[PDB]
Amino acid sequence: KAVDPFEMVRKMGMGTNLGNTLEAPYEGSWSKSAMEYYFDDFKAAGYKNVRIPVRWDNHTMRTYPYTIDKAFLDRVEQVVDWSLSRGFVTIINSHHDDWIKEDYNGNIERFEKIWEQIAERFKNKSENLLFEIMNEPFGNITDEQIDDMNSRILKIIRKTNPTRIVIIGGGYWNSYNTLVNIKIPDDPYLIGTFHYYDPYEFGTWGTQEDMDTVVRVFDFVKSWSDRNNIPVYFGAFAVMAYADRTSRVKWYDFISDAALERGFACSVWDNGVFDMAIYNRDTRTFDTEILNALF
Ligand SMILES: O[C@@H]1[C@@H](O)[C@H](O[C@@H]2CO[C@@H](O)[C@H](O)[C@H]2O)OC[C@H]1O
């Protein structure tokens, strides 16, 4: 007996991303690196969870045995503990580690070793630390390889983390269609996550129709959720350009109302740039209007 996915999702509520930080090529190379006070402010702001993207590529050896720099693991643990110590449901993953998609067969072992070491190093963390296998799994990889990856990375995790909730891609959506996974691993500690995906990238968001599209997507995902008995998590919503200020505020308010109503847990995307940012890391102030739209 441990905490179950549905209980975890209800607990996660609305949260935030620590974007363009640990998933940049090197911490700091993009947005300001992680500072402990970030978490004090997130807490004071109402966030109930913090997703922490991480790109392991440049901190892991490029050749066998694919060891992760101890120094980097220490760094991620420091940031995780700041989050966990403040009561946040904390999520860590693999983000922008595209090398794995560029050659699945050739790089899957390095990906396993990476996950092997992560699971090991955090095996004793609170139940509130969740393992998200890979940020946006859909794309330049086959549906079979995606399924193979989840099964094997999940199996690695389970050896040292028997009951820790793992997050895997449940599907994605766009203005034309929604895709959901039918092939779900047989595990009692999984949460499904969906992101906006468009296989044909080759307007501006915020309209009426756009909202009708999302409510549609959300209802289908919800049906998926009830049918497969698996909670839902929108790990990075509101990653779009809007026609104007008033439209942006409206979208955050809408999206979060619709998700929380259907019992979905979610994290807003915040790249810390002042440009899809809600929290200013230099002034330690939030875009109050948006924060109120989320809660
Ligand atoms: O500044 C850019 C970031 O905003 C960008 O972050 C992507 C935004 O969409 C989300 O779905 C992705 O997860 C997130 O990585 O990355 C590139 C950077 O230059």
Swiss-Prot record:
GO terms for molecular function: beta-glucosidase activity; cellulase activity. The keyword Signal applies. The active site is at E136, A236. Residues 1-295 are annotated as: Catalytic. Keywords: Carbohydrate metabolism, Cellulose degradation, Glycosidase, Hydrolase, Polysaccharide degradation, Signal. One of its GO terms (cellular component) is extracellular region. GO terms for biological process: cellulose catabolic process. This enzyme catalyzes the endohydrolysis of 1,4-beta-glucosidic linkages in cellulose, lichenin and cereal beta-D-glucans. In the N-terminal section; belongs to the glycosyl hydrolase 5 (cellulase A) family. This is Endoglucanase H. The lineage of its organism: Bacteria, Bacillati, Bacillota, Clostridia, Eubacteriales. The gene is celH.
